[PDB]
Structures are given as C-alpha cells and as structure tokens.
Amino acid sequence: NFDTSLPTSHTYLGADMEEFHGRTLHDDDSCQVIPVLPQVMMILIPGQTLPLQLFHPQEVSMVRNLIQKDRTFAVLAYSNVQEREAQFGTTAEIYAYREEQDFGIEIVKVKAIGRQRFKVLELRTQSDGIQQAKVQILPECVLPSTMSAVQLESLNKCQIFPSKPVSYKWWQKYQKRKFHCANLTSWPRWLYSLYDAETLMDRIKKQLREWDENLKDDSLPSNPIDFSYRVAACLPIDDVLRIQLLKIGSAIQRLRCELDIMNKCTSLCCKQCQETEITTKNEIFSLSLCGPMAAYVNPHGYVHETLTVYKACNLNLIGRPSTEHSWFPGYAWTVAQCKICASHIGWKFTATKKDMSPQKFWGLTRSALLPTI
C-alpha cells in the first residue's frame, strides 16, 4: 500500500526545481568533445535518471557554463577503478538545476538522464582541474522482421493480427501465421522465433512477473530499445555484465543476452566473503516505477545505489530509526554490516506510523554484493 511514484521524484533533495524542457540529439557517428565529471564510479544506462550534489569550484563552474549551452556532458564507465581508463561511455542530458548557499559554500543540485552511448576516442586534461573527452557517437541499429527479406509480398494481407486479448493459444497462432513463409527457407519456425523481438519481450515480461504481481503492461515500455534499456538497468549483476550489455549495439542481441543473464543468475552473496548467502533471486522485489534498483545521493555527497528486498541473513544491525534526508518520504533506517567481514552492506528500513506498510525492508548497495551463478 506504498505509493510507487513517490521515490522516483527524489523529493528528498528538493521540492521546487528549475525544470528544463527541450532535447538536443547529437548526430550519429559524429565526433564531439564533452566535459567529464571527475568523481563518478557509476555506469549509466540510457533512459535512467541520475541526481548529483556538487560543491567543487571547478565542477560548479563547469556546470554553470554547461547549463546554458546544451545541458549535456559525458559519463565514463571505468573498467578499472584504480587506473582511470575507459573505452565506452554514456552521454547525459541535464533536466534539473538548483543552487544553495551553506554559510559561504555554493552547492548545486542537478538531475540528468542518459541519452546515447559512445566509444571514447581521446581524452585531455584542461587547465581547470577537469577532463574533456572527444568521442564518436555509437549507432543504434534496428533490424526489420526476419520474414520480410524472404519474399516481397506473398500474403501481405495476413501479416497484421487482431488486437492481443487482455494466451498460450494466441501465441501459438501468432507463431504459426507470422512465420508461415519459413517453409521457403532452410530453417524451421521456432528457429526464426528465437530471434523475434516480441517473443523475447514476452518471455522477459513473464520471467519478471514473479517479482512484481501488480505490474501493468503500461508499466514497461513498448519499443524494443526502451524495453531492453529498462530491463538492463534493473538487474542485480556486477559491473562487467553491465559493460557487456552496454557494448551490444542491437536490441535483439541485448535482449538475448539479458535473458541469458536472467536465466543464469541464482543468488547473491557478500563481495568480501565470496561465500555468504545473503539473498536469492526470488526475494528481489521493487517498490518504484524505475525498478528494484535506482539512483540516490547521500547528503554527505556520495551517491549510493540501492535495491528493495524483504529478507536478509548474515547481517548485523546498528543504529536507531531516523528521518532527516531519507529518499523515500516517510521511513526509518539503520545501518547493517557483514556478520563475518563486519563491512557495511545496506540499510534496514521500518515503515512509518501512518496506516501500515511493509515493516521490514532491506535496501542494499550493489557495491558489496555479487551473484553466485
């Protein structure tokens, strides 16, 4: 009975924001140089939101200059954290901006979203403490239906289907009629359906439906690209898998890879332990429109990712309920640490007094988690 549109707005950082409307799509495959934030260790996927609080002179000056020219910058996914190198990154367009003063220090609140991918082709250090990377925009490839190339017309009047009823028989009929021309080739129908966008999307949704039972068809997007990006954003994997899914350039290949990852992963454990059952796949469940995983920012300055679950083991709780800058409006929270490693893992949340809602909530950070496929 908890609203799912509340945490998405990030009301904690602020209520009134200077929203900016307008879009600027960079031409594909072009070469352009854009500034890069100095301290960012998060891999950003297109269509995901990102807040940020900044208080550094050079970074604040960069944002102030940028907020009037195009409102776009770049984020680099670091293959290795120690050595700052990267081959792929994501363009980010800012859609929010606010300023605050704290007795003599300027603080900037920014909200942006990923737009496009790219392969870094050069980077340089400007004489201001920041970096500027020149990169070529990667392409987004969409392929036509596999059966369109087989023939020209044949029976085109039968290629359009009646509206899907609000299903097994319907899917069987869809496969049987859509790929009827498959008999003119050397491969059966199911082989072609294995590379069909709609069937892959339906399989993905069926797999996910266990986690959320109130999921609505409108809840997930319809276009293959948007669906693929959304699914890739909200999966509990390590950074290598995210980079792999980022490298893929075709929607079909990304969907197949995501389905493989979903069917492979079984459970998650403490990164420091490397063997400690903390949670399984079934336990995953979302409480926000974006999904189980989303971006947030600590008022201290560090931005931590967190998910939503209802069960934890091998955890030691520490602290008492508090509410000063909590991301969701109304909730308690206490720190948790690894029972063996003693390392901080996540935060245990207790619902608020108003009405009633899930009393025990576990929100962890992927930084201290690792699957056990």
């Binding site: 190339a149 017309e153 044949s154 009646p162 491969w187 294995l194 079909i252």
Partner: protein, 808 residues
C-alpha cells in the same frame, strides 16, 4: 581485393504477377507474366499460348497493371520496382522489330519513413485519371495522369488510419473514390474517401463507415451496373453499396483462406477465387431488375470448381481456359467444362510449366561417371515437393514428384543411393494420433521402419509434421526405403562419410527434441545408420543436451554444433562416438564450414568466426572474428583467405582475413572486401560445375535461391577484373535498359538504412548480353580501348567474352 565474377545459369521460374489485356494490338488478347526480374508477353490463341516477347528489368517487379487512357489505340503498362522506380511503357512493333518504349519514368522514394508491414500497394483509377500508391504507413501517394507528366511527379496525402489492411478504387463514381478496410483497437472497418486533385486532399466518401468481420482481407471493386464493393474474410463474404448490404457464410470455405481472385465476365457476374490449398471456387452474383431502375444484387453463391496447383495468381483467358501462376510448383493452364467428371471436378488439366523454385538444398554428382556433372535439387513444398535433376545438354530438367516437403539431400556412391530428409503434414485424430492427408513417398516405401530408442521416456484438429529419411535409388528414382523418426522430433542436418579406420560408409543425422511449451531445445540426437543389402540399420546413436544445428566431416572425425558450442568427436573401434575436443562461444553455430584445418562458424545475425584446430595439442584456438548486426542466409569458403555470404536485402558480401596485418589487433579482424546486390534470396551454396572439365577463372561455386534461379561465382585476376570493369562501364554507357533505370543504382548494396556502390563483383549478365548487339554499337563500345598493348579491336573483346561464356 576480391576480383570475383557472378553469372546466372538458369533464369528464375516462379511467377509473381500475371495480367491480361489488349497490349500488342487493339484486337489481340495478350497475357503478361512477371517472374521476379523477367517479363514475358504471350498472345492467347485457340490452341494455347504463343510466346511473343521477353525482356528483363533492372529491379524486382512489385506492381504491374494495364490501362488505356482516352485517345489510345492500345493499353500502356505501369510498372513499379522494389526500389521504388516507377515507369510507364508502351509496346512498339515496326515490321520484324519488337521493343518497348519508355513513355515515362521516375522515382517515388521518400526521404524518411518506415515501410508499411503490409507492403507496397498500387492501384489505378478505372477512369484512368491518377495512380494511387501505399508505401509507408500513414501516407498515401497520388500520381496525376497527364500527358505532361513525363517525370511522374506525385504528392502525398495524410491518412489518419495507420494500419490499412487493403484498399481499392470504385466504379461508377463522378469523382475518384477509394474504399479501404483498415484496423484499429476497436476492430476492422471499411471507409470511403474522395480524392481531390485540385486541393490535393480527402473528402467524405459516398457512404459512411461500417464494421466488418474481424478477419476481412480482400476488397473487390464490382463494376457497373452493380457497383459497390465486396469484402472477403476468413468465414464470410459481404457486399456493400451504401444503403444496400448483403452477406453470406459458405461453410465450404472455412477450411482454407482465400488469397487470390480474378474477374471472369466483363459485367462482374462471376469471379474465380483461389485459396491456400490448391482449390478453385467460382463465385456467382445474381441480378434482379426492378421496374425501370438499375439492376440490383439479390444473392451470392460459391461453387467448388475443383483442385489445381497452389495458386499465386489467376487469370481467365477465354472459352473457360484459366492460367494459374504458382510459386511453390509448376504453373498450369487448365480448362473448365460445363459438366462434371465422375469425381466431381470441373477442371481438366491442359498444360504445365516447370518451376524449380523454391530451392532448399542441392548437390552435384556424376551419375554417368564421365567428367560432366549433374545437379540434384529439392524443389517445392507441400504437395508440390519433388526432386529436380538438371544436366547440360538450354538446360535439360527431369522431375520426380514426392508429394511432401524435402529438406536435405546427400549422395553415397558405394551404395548408389540418395538419402533425403523430408516432412509431411498429418492431422490429429479423434482417438489421439496422426493421419496423413494423401499418399506420399514416405508412406509408400517398399520397406518401412520406425525409430525405437526410448532415450527420453494436444487437441483435436491440430496439425503436426512427421519427419522421415528416404533412401532413393539413383537410376529409376524410386523410393527404396523409408525410416520414421520419433514423435515431436525434428531433423536438422545430414551427412554421409567414413570415420576413423572403419571402411564402411554411414549416414549421420542430427536431430532436435522440441516441445511447444519450451522456447529453446534442450535435448537432441546424433544417429549413425548403415544401409546395406536394401535394409537400414541403426548402427549407433548418441544423445546430446541441446540441438545439433549442423555437422561436417573433419579429417576422419565428426564436427558438430550444439547450441552455442562446437564439439569434435572421434570414431573408436567399438562403433561409438567419444567426445575429443570442445569449444565454447557466445553465439549459436548455425552455419559450419571446413577447409583443411580452418573452421568457419556463422550465426543468423551475420556474426562470423574463424577457428583452427591444433593437432599437437588437440584444442581449438580462435583466429579471427567479425560482428555486424544484419540478417544472413548462407556462408561459404572460396579459398584459404576469402569467405562469401548472403545478407538481408538480397545482397552478397565477401570478407577476407587480413593476414598481412602487423599487430594482433589487425590480425584478428576480418576486413570486408566485396558488396553486391544480387536481387535474389540465396538459399544454398555448393562446390561444383555443370560443364565437362590456363583458364581465366579459378574455382566455381553454385548457389540456389528461392525463385528457382541458379547462379555461379568464380574468381579472377586483377588485370581481368579491371578490363571487365571498364567494359561494363562502357556497355552501360552505350546500351539502354527498359524503364530507363541506371544499372549502377540497380547493383548498389541496399539495406534500408545504408547504400554503397557495388565493389569487387563483376556482373556477368551484362557482359554476356554484350554479344546480342549490332556491330556499330560494338565499335562504339570498343573505341579507345587498351588491351594486351594495342588498339584492342572488337575481335579481342568477342573472343574474351566467348571464353567467359564457355564456363557455362
């Protein structure tokens, strides 16, 4: 760096268009047939069809029509290609010369837009006032019909309906009127519009919108005096004329789906209807006269005329003679009789025309033991399936009917027999089981057997596929043996070879276990049969976890592809398979080819991998790779460094391994070197030749397509490649094509998202046609030509072209 050469040995046979009318003269009844890129023109006479003309177009013919503007002695032909080249042509004959005059031409492509799923649609006003086209969703293009439109300039109009199932014009309307059936969330509806050329817009049509069946697909524009339109769907036939509305549901139609129609009488009193299962119906329209008013409809009837080949287009010629153009089988010319035979069919077969396509697999052998090869192909589908033997004599073709769908074929000299994989359609029974629909080769084998392994331990009216392995003699082409596979099983690959020290020759078959609930296979088999003394034995079998997508004999061992894995088995002395080497990749190895110690792996997404086998270590090391999202049909190996493949949009591409690279990064990348627009959907590649065994060409690869076309590809040298390129440029400059289409644009690599000029491929058809021209044009072409150096007179070119043509 390719220097290749591609030519056509057999012209396409599948017919995709047919029309009838007075084209060559005001009083001659003409039949026009469009087979992919070929146009044929016959004059219908009492005895049959007399061929008159035949030409080729630089494109795929998607729309064809005949129309007679006011003040024209004869008709004019409007043609549109798959690349949106449109033209209007006329038939000109002076004495003994025949040629088609390009009255007008142009291109009607759009800068942006997603092509409609239902495909290109083209119609003409019955008054001959304009041409309507539907190419991209949400738009409707109109071309005015005026004598001053030699450029064919059209304009677009917006349609608020996105998914338009079908569209047609209407008869007997003062202003151009279009009736069309479309779909939306509520269902399917039919609506009418009036086209305003002066304002270039739409106006409310004669009668308002109405709701139709949930499967309406066919729109027929009845002529005067009836008017109105007829909507044909899955289970009902209706007639709308505004206020007047009639409907009937003939039960004898529920079995199949009407897909073709044609008009018999000029006043629309009868029609011919053709379904998916080779059936032919005759639809009748009764007429009633009331007082002194225009006659009206009274009722509708459908009568089952009979059975023919699976029909793609129908045309009534005269005296109850009908042409049935088909794509899955031979075209037919049949007759209709007033009475009925004992069986009850009114159709009497008269004449047939061969149709090799579709080609799903082939092999090259030498039955006569001479040096001259022969080609054996698996042609057709469903009750049209058969084997085709092609040998050079024009090509000599022999047909062996099967009455089911063949899928694979291989040859085994020692036993003197062919092994064929096949499938037939069976219907579930009331008691639970399967019943065949007709006699077939699978059920008429002299000896029969059923696989019995037990290694793994529905509804009514559903359809299932039964797979079979057929052993066929090589002299009489009679089914020696038949073997049936387990229920729910699928056959994918077939080979015949010898393994290890075993001197016998086996058939090795790969099969998958598929279930409707599961989306991907999880269990399959490799079966080793031996056929001796006229009986087939299950020598051995191995169960794998996956689906064997291919197999190739690899220097005494067996190479198999299981899901996304490559495995190499050996053949011990105990008559069994023992896994020897393994390799894991990230793609499904659908295509597998071998050459010495190199293995080429290909996926349906046009991902290419090149691996090698390490004899000293017995393990696989990856050598090279290449990834580019696109659809791929087939792959082949030309030599140690070149690879060939067929790509979406009917394209050919050639990649090369960059062995001259300095660093590992370049050494591990495959550079693309050749692009070409074939215009056909290549289905199979093979090594061999049809001519009896210093030459200007090395090697030869044959390829078979879906339209029944057969092509040949060979290599060349730099000097010859340059010479041929110059010759082709000159010939394109000199000769003229029907429809005034630029040849280079025709052979441009098209992908619906990017276009590049063809490189590395020398078109052979143009060079071959080089010989049909008169001497003065040859002199013009050869003028200022440097050939080994000298003035390079036309005699040298003629000799070289003859040398090239000799290869086939």
């Amino acid at each position: 760096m390719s220097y290749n050469y591609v030519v056509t040995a057999q012209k396409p046979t599948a017919v995709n268009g047919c029309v009838t009318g007075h084209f060559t003269s005001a009083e001659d009844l003409n039949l026009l047939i469009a087979k992919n890129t070929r146009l044929e023109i016959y004059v219908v006479t009492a005895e049959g069809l007399r061929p008159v003309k035949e030409v080729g177009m630089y494109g795929k013919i998607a729309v064809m029509e005949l129309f007679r503007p006011k003040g024209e002695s004869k008709d004019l032909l409007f043609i549109l290609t798959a690349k949106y080249n449109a033209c209007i042509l006329e038939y000109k004959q002076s004495g003994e010369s025949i040629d088609i005059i390009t009255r007008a031409h142009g291109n009607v492509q759009d800068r942006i837009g997603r092509p409609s799923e239902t495909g290109i649609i083209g119609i003409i006003d019955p008054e001959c006032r304009m041409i309507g086209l539907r190419l991209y969703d949400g738009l409707f293009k109109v071309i005015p019909l005026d004598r001053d439109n030699k450029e064919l300039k059209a304009f677009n109009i917006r349609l608020e309906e996105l998914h338009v199932i079908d569209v047609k014009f209407l008869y007997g309307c003062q202003a151009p009127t279009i009736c069309f059936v479309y779909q939306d969330p509520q269902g399917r509806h039919v609506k009418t519009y009036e086209v305003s050329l002066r304002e270039k817009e739409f106006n409310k049509g004669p009668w308002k919108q109405e709701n139709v069946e949930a499967e309406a697909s066919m729109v027929i524009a009845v002529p005067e005096p009836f008017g109105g339109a007829i909507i044909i769907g899955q289970e009902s036939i209706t007639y709308h004329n505004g206020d007047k509305y009639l409907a009937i549901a003939p039960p004898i139609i529920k079995q199949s789906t009407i897909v073709c129609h044609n008009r018999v009488d000029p006043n629309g009193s009868r029609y011919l209807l053709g379904d998916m299962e080779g059936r032919l119906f005759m639809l009748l329209l009764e007429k009633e006269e009331q007082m002194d008013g225009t006659v009206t409809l009274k009722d509708l009837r459908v009568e089952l005329l009979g059975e023919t080949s699976i029909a793609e287009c129908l045309t009534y010629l005269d005296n109850g003679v009908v042409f049935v153009g088909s794509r899955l089988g031979d075209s037919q010319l049949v007759k209709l009789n007033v009475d009925s035979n004992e069986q009850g069919s009114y159709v009497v077969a008269m004449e047939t025309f061969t149709n090799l396509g579709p080609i799903v697999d082939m092999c090259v052998v030498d039955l006569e033991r001479q040096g001259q090869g022969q080609l054996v192909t698996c042609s057709g589908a469903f009750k049209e399936g058969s084997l085709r033997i092609i040998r050079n004599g024009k090509l000599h073709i022999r047909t062996v009917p099967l009455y089911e769908s063949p899928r694979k074929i291989c040859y085994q000299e020692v036993s003197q027999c062919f092994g064929v994989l096949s499938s037939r359609i069976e219907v579930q029974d009331t008691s639970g089981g399967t019943t065949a629909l007709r006699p077939s080769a699978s059920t008429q084998a002299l000896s029969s057997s059923v696989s019995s392994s037990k290694l793994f331990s529905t509804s009514f009216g559903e359809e299932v596929e039964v797979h079979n392995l057929l052993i066929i003699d090589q002299h009489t082409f009679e089914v020696l043996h038949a073997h049936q596979f387990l229920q729910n099983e699928y056959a994918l690959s077939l080979v015949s070879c010898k393994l290890g020290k075993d001197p016998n020759t086996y058939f090795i078959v790969g099969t998958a276990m598929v279930y409707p609930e599961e989306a991907e296979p999880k269990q399959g088999r490799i079966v080793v049969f031996q056929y001796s003394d006229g009986k087939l034995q299950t020598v051995a079998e191995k169960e794998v976890k996956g689906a064997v997508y291919s197999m190739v004999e690899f220097n005494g061992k067996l190479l198999a592809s299981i899901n996304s894995t490559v495995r190499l088995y050996e053949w011990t002395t105990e008559k069994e398979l023992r896994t020897e080497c393994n390799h894991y990749n990230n793609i499904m190895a659908l295509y597998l080819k071998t050459k010495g110690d190199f293995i080429l792996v290909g996926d349906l997404m046009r991902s290419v991998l090149l691996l090698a086998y390490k004899p000293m270590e017995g393990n696989f090391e990856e050598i090279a790779r290449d990834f580019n999202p696109n659809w791929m049909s087939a792959v082949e190996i030309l030599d140690d460094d070149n690879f060939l493949g067929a790509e979406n949009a009917f394209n050919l591409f050639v990649c090369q391994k960059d062995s001259a690279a300095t660093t590992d990064e370049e050494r591990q990348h495959l550079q693309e070197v050749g692009l070409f627009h074939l215009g056909e959907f290549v289905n199979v590649f093979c090594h061999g030749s049809l001519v009896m065994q210093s030459t200007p060409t090395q090697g030869s690869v044959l390829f078979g397509t879906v339209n029944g076309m057969i092509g040949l590809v060979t290599s060349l040298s730099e000097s010859w490649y340059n010479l041929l390129l110059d010759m082709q440029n000159r010939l394109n400059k000199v000769i003229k094509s029907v429809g005034k289409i630029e040849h280079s644009f025709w052979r441009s690599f098209h992908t619906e998202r990017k276009t590049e000029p063809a490189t590395g491929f020398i078109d052979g058809d143009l060079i071959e046609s080089f010989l049909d021209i008169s001497r003065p044009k040859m002199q013009e072409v050869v003028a200022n030509l440097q050939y080994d150096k000298r003035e390079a007179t036309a005699d040298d070119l003629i000799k070289v072209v003859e040398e090239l043509t000799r290869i086939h």
